Amino acid sequence: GEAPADRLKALVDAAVQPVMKANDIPGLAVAISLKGEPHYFSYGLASKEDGRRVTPETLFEIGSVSKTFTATLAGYALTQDKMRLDDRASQHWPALQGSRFDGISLLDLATYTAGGLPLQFPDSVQKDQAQIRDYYRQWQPTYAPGSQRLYSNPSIGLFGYLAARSLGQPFERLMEQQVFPALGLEQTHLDVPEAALAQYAQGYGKDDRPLRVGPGPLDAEGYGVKTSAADLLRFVDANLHPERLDRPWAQALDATHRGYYKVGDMTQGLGWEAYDWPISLKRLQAGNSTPMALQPHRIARLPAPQALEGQRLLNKTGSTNGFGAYVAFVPGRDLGLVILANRNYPNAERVKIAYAILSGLEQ
Numbered sequence: 001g002e003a004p005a006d007r008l009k010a011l012v013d014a015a016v017q018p019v020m021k022a023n024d025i026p027g028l029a030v031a032i033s034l035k036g037e038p039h040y041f042s043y044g045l046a047s048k049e050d051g052r053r054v055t056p057e058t059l060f061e062i063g064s065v066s067k068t069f070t071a072t073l074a075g076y077a078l079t080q081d082k083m084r085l086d087d088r089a090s091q092h093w094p095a096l097q098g099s100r101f102d103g104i105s106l107l108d109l110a111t112y113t114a115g116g117l118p119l120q121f122p123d124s125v126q127k128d129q130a131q132i133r134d135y136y137r138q139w140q141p142t143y144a145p146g147s148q149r150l151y152s153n154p155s156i157g158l159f160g161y162l163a164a165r166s167l168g169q170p171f172e173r174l175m176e177q178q179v180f181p182a183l184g185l186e187q188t189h190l191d192v193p194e195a196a197l198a199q200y201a202q203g204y205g206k207d208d209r210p211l212r213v214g215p216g217p218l219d220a221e222g223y224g225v226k227t228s229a230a231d232l233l234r235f236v237d238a239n240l241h242p243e244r245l246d247r248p249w250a251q252a253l254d255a256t257h258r259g260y261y262k263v264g265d266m267t268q269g270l271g272w273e274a275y276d277w278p279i280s281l282k283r284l285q286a287g288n289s290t291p292m293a294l295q296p297h298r299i300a301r302l303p304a305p306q307a308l309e310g311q312r313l314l315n316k317t318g319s320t321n322g323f324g325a326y327v328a329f330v331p332g333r334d335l336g337l338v339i340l341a342n343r344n345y346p347n348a349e350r351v352k353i354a355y356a357i358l359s360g361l362e363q
């Protein structure tokens with residue numbers, strides 16, 4: 001009958017539309033994987049000025065959701081024995097030998113526990129290998145590696161970069177030529193082709209100034225992916241079913257489903273951040289709050305890596321100046337969700353949309 005499709009549309013509309021209105025979001029794409037089938041719901045405008053509507057193929061900046069792609073490349077390097085998570089960072093870049101990176105592991109970099117690497121590179125560091133090298137050579141930990149989590153692009157950026165070095169090829173080339181094709185992603189880019197620019201949404205900030213992401217140090221590793229809701233859901237489905245990929249890539253995805261420590265309700269994997277499921281909306285918002293992004297937290301290390309599967313919610317937020325993305329999936333329920341918007345709107349609001357959809361699907 002039509003009831004299931006009507007109910008799903010009613011549910012997604014009811015979750016999305018008030019949040020779009022309340023946050024003045026011009027355009028938003030939702031994609032849901034439910035019972036092995038994709039469902040797309042598209043809202044509003046990709047560009048207010050030219051009237052292009054959002055579709056499941058519209059490209060959005062996903063910001064730090066890119067970190068989950070970076071983690072997958074690292075998972076490939078790891079499970080191919082080109083690196084180990086307990087390697088010292090300077091093993092993989094001679095320029096760092098003699099620096100504090102002699103005493104910092106790849107896991108620490110990946111999980112933001114190297115000792116106080118900041119959220120962003122300073123403005124003084126441009127997209128330049130020598131400036132990035134000198135930044136790391138001069139950096140000193142604020143506190144002991146392995147003790148506190150401080151969310152950081154330079155941290156997981158370096159992890160990604162070193163994983164590429166371990167494979168003997170540039171990060172960006174590996175992503176284009178190996179990772180994205182292995183995952184079946186033809187609408188996913190670090191550098192959007194000229195021929196696909198018509199699909200690239202406009203981003204909008206304060207006073208609706210147009211904003212698309214510019215070049216920056218380790219941008220590719222930290223925040224550089226542009227993709228469509230359909231492609232991002234394909235990536236969620238790969239995460240739900242790594243066994244559907246060839247074994248080297250299956251293993252790469254599995255490596256991003258391992259938790260190393262907890263902070264509050266959140267268990268930190270490579271890229272993904274996990275919660276028990278069900279959990280309250282308020283606790284999931286708290287785990288995705290501004291203090292979790294901006295302040296250091298003492299970790300509770302697990303006795304061994306924990307499988308992030310079963311009745312757990314794995315998620316990641318991503319932001320750029322003009323865009324706000326969120327992805328969440330529940331491995332034990334074969335359920336995934338992507339919410340891409342062309343405004344950077346509060347994380348709590350992204351989580352509210354997702355939670356309304358997930359709750360409604362339960363009910």
Ligand SMILES: *[B@@]([O])(O[C][C][O])C1=[C][C]=[C][C]=[C]1
Nearest residue numbers: 063064119153223317318319
């Ligand atoms: B990223 O989008 O993370 C914020 C949303 O969790 C990010 C972090 C640091 C620099 C650029 C992008």
Ligand SMILES: [Cl-]
Nearest residue numbers: 120121153154
């Ligand atoms: Cl940065």
